[PDB]
């Protein structure tokens, strides 16, 4: 018996680096998802390319846990930076994750809290400790640990930035899958962590420059995840 | 072999009427979802209580299709009315569904279209025909057929109604799961239809009157689904 490590990225570029390192690779496709199973430095992994956004991530995470038998989930890829200390390419590690675009305050929930869910999804303590160790193995890579907020939006306006900061002042980064991954993992009682890297600062120029910085972000976040899975073997 | 009809409702009250009609019932729970399997007037059904919101609906729909082997999906329950002809308790039938809260327009997608997804999810022609025949079997029940818009929000402010109407002028009703169910069905190439009923008109009065009319909405939409399953079996 060994841990089975799920790794989730949304986009082809976010998974390709890790894909090509897997040994004893097998491939499955289902519901628009691709699953690459094998070993990464002797760790048993299942690497999922989910697609973008909350529903795609939830579909894929569900399959990853229910059909691919993973024990923990690591979410890799790019994110939009909100913490002022971040630079492009820097790592972000989730302490917790929230939906920035959920509002059932009608019924007394706090902003971001989905009905019947906790207000925040707490990343696993052991996986955070593993992420810290993984970061030390990189060459002078800066990270920030903190709240990651997700919505079905690529944030690129000052108005949407101000809404998010009004309700989630501690937010360090935004993206489009983490809270779906985290919620699904909560429903399945599965440990998770998000270890992404910054592609942009979620401003008006960001949609145009995303593509130029995605390779950097994918490289950083992939190097984190490779170091983590090796630590977990 | 017979068609296996999946039926999805978010809340206990949305599934309770149908649950008690099932014959040869068996129950299982997974990931915060409850699945009620048996027959409804001789049709093979799997009735899912998913939970509220897009992620919960996606998790449940994924299990319903992948693990419970359903061939079609009917989404039941309550919705907030937008079309001016709708009264409390009236039925809404989806022609198509969109995410009202998705925005990746800066990458060229249209409003509401998720990246890597079609702009709208089209309800199945045969299931819509069946819904129309079910509606005729009711005693003088008014319905509107049209676009249903989903988001992770219980809509109850004029500002949010105005945003939705600005971007989706043909919307007939809003709710919190349909686009997740429909996207998941798209990904699984599974037919779907939404056949909900009106609990409120998505205004400032709607948070505190929802509960009074949820039983009415559950009654109408359950009667539609029961009529449909008899026809589809
Ligand atoms: N600005 C942004 N908004 C949402 N997701 C991402 C992912 C990278 N940049 C982002
Ligand atoms: N006003 C509303 N907004 C979202 N979903 C529902 C479901 C019933 N009424 C609704
Ligand atoms: Ca062992
Ligand atoms: Ca290789
Ligand atoms: Ca560019
Ligand atoms: Cl890509
Ligand atoms: Cl920090
Ligand atoms: Cl209920
Ligand atoms: Cl949800
Ligand atoms: Cl009509």
Swiss-Prot record, chains A, B:
<dbReference type="GO" id="GO:0009164">
    <property type="term" value="P:nucleoside catabolic process"/>
</dbReference>
<dbReference type="InterPro" id="IPR035994">
    <property type="entry name" value="Nucleoside_phosphorylase_sf"/>
</dbReference>
<protein>
    <recommendedName>
        <fullName>5'-methylthioadenosine/S-adenosylhomocysteine nucleosidase</fullName>
        <ecNumber>3.2.2.9</ecNumber>
    </recommendedName>
</protein>
<comment type="function">
    <text>Catalyzes the irreversible cleavage of the glycosidic bond in both 5'-methylthioadenosine (MTA) and S-adenosylhomocysteine (SAH/AdoHcy) to adenine and the corresponding thioribose, 5'-methylthioribose and S-ribosylhomocysteine, respectively. Also cleaves 5'-deoxyadenosine, a toxic by-product of radical S-adenosylmethionine (SAM) enzymes, into 5-deoxyribose and adenine.</text>
</comment>
<feature type="active site" description="Proton acceptor">
    <location>
        <position position="14"/>
    </location>
</feature>
<dbReference type="GO" id="GO:0019284">
    <property type="term" value="P:L-methionine salvage from S-adenosylmethionine"/>
</dbReference>
<dbReference type="GO" id="GO:0008782">
    <property type="term" value="F:adenosylhomocysteine nucleosidase activity"/>
</dbReference>
<keyword id="KW-0378">Hydrolase</keyword>
<keyword id="KW-0028">Amino-acid biosynthesis</keyword>
<comment type="similarity">
    <text>Belongs to the PNP/UDP phosphorylase family. MtnN subfamily.</text>
</comment>
<dbReference type="InterPro" id="IPR000845">
    <property type="entry name" value="Nucleoside_phosphorylase_d"/>
</dbReference>
<feature type="active site" description="Proton donor">
    <location>
        <position position="200"/>
    </location>
</feature>
<dbReference type="GO" id="GO:0019509">
    <property type="term" value="P:L-methionine salvage from methylthioadenosine"/>
</dbReference>
<feature type="binding site">
    <location>
        <begin position="176"/>
        <end position="177"/>
    </location>
    <ligand>
        <name>substrate</name>
    </ligand>
</feature>
<dbReference type="GO" id="GO:0005829">
    <property type="term" value="C:cytosol"/>
</dbReference>
<feature type="binding site">
    <location>
        <position position="80"/>
    </location>
    <ligand>
        <name>substrate</name>
    </ligand>
</feature>
<feature type="binding site">
    <location>
        <position position="155"/>
    </location>
    <ligand>
        <name>substrate</name>
    </ligand>
</feature>
<dbReference type="Pfam" id="PF01048">
    <property type="entry name" value="PNP_UDP_1"/>
</dbReference>
<comment type="pathway">
    <text>Amino-acid biosynthesis; L-methionine biosynthesis via salvage pathway; S-methyl-5-thio-alpha-D-ribose 1-phosphate from S-methyl-5'-thioadenosine (hydrolase route): step 1/2.</text>
</comment>
<keyword id="KW-0486">Methionine biosynthesis</keyword>
<dbReference type="GO" id="GO:0008930">
    <property type="term" value="F:methylthioadenosine nucleosidase activity"/>
</dbReference>
<dbReference type="InterPro" id="IPR010049">
    <property type="entry name" value="MTA_SAH_Nsdase"/>
</dbReference>
């Amino acid at each position: 018996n060994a841990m089975k490590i799920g790794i989730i990225g949304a986009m082809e570029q976010e998974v390709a680096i890790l894909k090509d390192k897997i040994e004893g690779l097998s491939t499955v496709t289902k519901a628009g998802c691709t699953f690459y199973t094998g070993t990464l430095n002797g760790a048993d992994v299942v690497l999922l390319q989910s697609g973008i956004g909350k529903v795609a991530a939830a579909v894929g995470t569900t399959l990853l846990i229910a059909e691919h038998n993973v024990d923990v989930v690591l979410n890799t890829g790019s994110a939009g930076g909100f913490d002022s200390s971040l630079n492009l390419g820097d790592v972000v590690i989730s302490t917790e994750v929230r939906h920035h675009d959920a509002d059932v305050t009608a019924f007394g929930y706090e902003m971001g809290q989905m009905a019947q869910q906790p207000a925040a999804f707490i990343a696993d303590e052991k996986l955070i400790t593993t992420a810290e160790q993984a970061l030390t193995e990189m060459s002078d890579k800066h990270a920030v640990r903190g709240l990651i907020c997700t919505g079905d939006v690529f944030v690129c306006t000052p108005e949407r930035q101000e809404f998010i900061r009004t309700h989630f002042p501690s937010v360090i980064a935004v993206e489009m899958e983490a809270s779906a991954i985290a919620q699904t993992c909560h429903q399945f009682n599965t440990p998770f962590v998000v270890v992404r890297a910054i592609s942009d600062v979620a401003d008006k120029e960001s949609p145009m420059s995303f593509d130029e910085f995605l390779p950097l972000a994918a490289q950083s976040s992939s190097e984190m995840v490779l170091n983590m899975v090796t630590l977990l073997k």
